[PDB]
């Protein structure tokens, strides 16, 4: 695409977000979307022309075509810099997004989850905003969803929250994530297993309190069993997750040994796949530190 020195064209587009001509409205919405799918400089032009408050307000539209595109514009803006994410938060996006997590329209629901995930990919300030807006309860509930597509989205958003500081991880734990995540570890669906492990491993990246909650919820037997998975990605993920657990205190280390991990970690050091050899030796190092 093409360079454009954004002048009064943008502000006029933002104003047409109010147009009673839904054709003119949609047209402007699409152009704002396209611009926000560019780099940070383009994203910044959209923010600086005042688009955010009107986009956020469109999240209460009863017109799904408008709503879905505004959500998409917001999600793109939130895929930029932390200060861009923070502009979306300041404009009031979070409560409207959290509301949408109860939508029975799976397209809107996915898009809200996606937008939330992008906001939660920012710094700990952005993550804390998501927690404070009350997103956790809905996210945790979606862990029991029979909808694999919604489930993966929810898992990615929770995983993002769980990659923050220890208190942010602890909020995820306090909202009850762990039992549903532990149960996912018995899924026959390896794609789900991979996604659940990404999220659980982040939780296990916390401090000893957070690690002990993982052990308390029953994670270890399921993890240890996945060290025999024939899928090598899963095998990698479970090593990574166990290593994180292993890096805690003596109490945490002892739990890992009691669950039988030590012997498995040792054999996997010789695995054919180098990525596994490396994850295994690094998990063993953590345990044995
Ligand atoms: Ca409608
Ligand atoms: Ca539906
Ligand atoms: Ca299904
Ligand atoms: Ca399977």
Author numbering: 4 to 292
Could you give the paper's own sentences about this structure?
The armadillo repeat serves as a scaffold for the development of modular peptide-recognition modules. In order to develop such a system, three crystal structures of designed armadillo-repeat proteins with third-generation N-caps (YIII-type), four or five internal repeats (M-type) and second-generation C-caps (AII-type) were determined at 1.8 Å (His-YIIIM4AII), 2.0 Å (His-YIIIM5AII) and 1.95 Å (YIIIM5AII) resolution and compared with those of variants with third-generation C-caps. All constructs are full consensus designs in which the internal repeats have exactly the same sequence, and hence identical conformations of the internal repeats are expected.
The crystal structures of His-YIIIM4AII and His-YIIIM5AII were refined at 1.8 and 2.0 Å resolution, respectively. In both cases the asymmetric units contain tetramers with 222 point symmetry and very similar topologies. The quaternary structures of His-YIIIM4AII and His-YIIIM5AII are governed by calcium ions that connect neighbouring chains in a zipper-like manner and the His6 tag that binds to the supposed peptide-binding site, albeit in different orientations (see below). In contrast to this, the crystallographic tetramer of His-YIIIM5AII is less symmetric. Here, chains A/B and C/D are pairwise identical (r.m.s.d. of 0.05 Å), whereas an r.m.s.d. of 0.85 Å for the comparison between pairs (e.g. chain A with D) suggests substantial differences. Furthermore, His-YIIIM5AII chains A/B are more similar to His-YIIIM4AII (r.m.s.d. of 0.72 Å for the superposition of residues 14–210 on the equivalent residues from His-YIIIM4AII) than chains C/D (r.m.s.d. of 1.17 Å). These differences are caused by different contacts within the tetramer. The structures of His-YIIIM4AII and YIIIM5AII represent extreme cases that are most different. In His-YIIIM5AII these differences are combined into a single structure. His-YIIIM5AII chains A/B and C/D represent the conformations seen in His-YIIIM4AII (all chains) and YIIIM5AII (all chains), respectively.
